[PDB]
């Protein structure tokens, strides 16, 4: 139903991070990508709301957090911009939580 893959996304090919004093670190950051065809539906009901949506999207099952290190750094950069914390997992599932936020 869903499919997991590590993928490069426009904003992170490469990712640029700038601290105060203007020092920047750059580097590719793979992101966890869930894609596929969830089973969804919309139907009429009684009362309010008059509609019922089983709306679902392919979401990552988060099981850990990855510290991705950015390599290409300007001379004298803060360590806070030398890494990124990315939610990590290995599987996808159909879920409506992305629709909530």
């Amino acid at each position: 139903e869903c499919e997991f893959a590590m993928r490069l996304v426009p904003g992170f090919n490469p990712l640029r991070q700038v601290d105060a004093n203007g020092k920047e670190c750059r580097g590719n950051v793979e992101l966890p990508f869930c894609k596929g065809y969830c089973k969804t539906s919309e139907s009429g009901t009684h009362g309010f709301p008059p509609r019922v949506q089983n709306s679902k999207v392919c979401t990552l099952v988060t099981t850990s957090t990855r510290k991705v290190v950015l390599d290409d750094c300007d001379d004298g950069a803060d360590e806070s911009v030398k890494f990124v914390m990315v939610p990590h997992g290995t599987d996808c599932e159909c879920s409506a939580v992305p629709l909530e936020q």
Partner: protein
């Protein structure tokens, strides 16, 4: 991507009122979606389609209850399509 119109018979069996079968339409299908955690915006990035009824008609019926008849309203699909989940 396949979102289809599906016929539904629906039985109303409430204590006091006569049993009533109502035939309406609902959408059911599978549309493509993709989602990834964006740690820059610290949120989910979603690009997703859901199977939804674009157009519908109201179906009105009288429910013969012993202590007063009730007037029911149900949307019934007329076109089912893959469209934005959040619209």
């Amino acid at each position: 991507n396949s979102c289809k119109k599906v016929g539904v018979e629906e039985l109303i069996n409430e204590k006091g009122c006569d049993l009533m079968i109502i035939r309406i339409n609902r959408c059911r299908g599978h549309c493509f979606s993709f989602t990834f955690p964006n740690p820059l915006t610290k949120k989910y990035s979603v690009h997703a389609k859901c199977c939804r009824m674009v157009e519908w008609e109201m179906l009105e019926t009288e429910l013969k209850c012993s202590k007063g008849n009730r007037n029911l309203r149900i949307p019934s699909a007329t076109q089912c399509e893959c469209f934005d989940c959040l619209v």
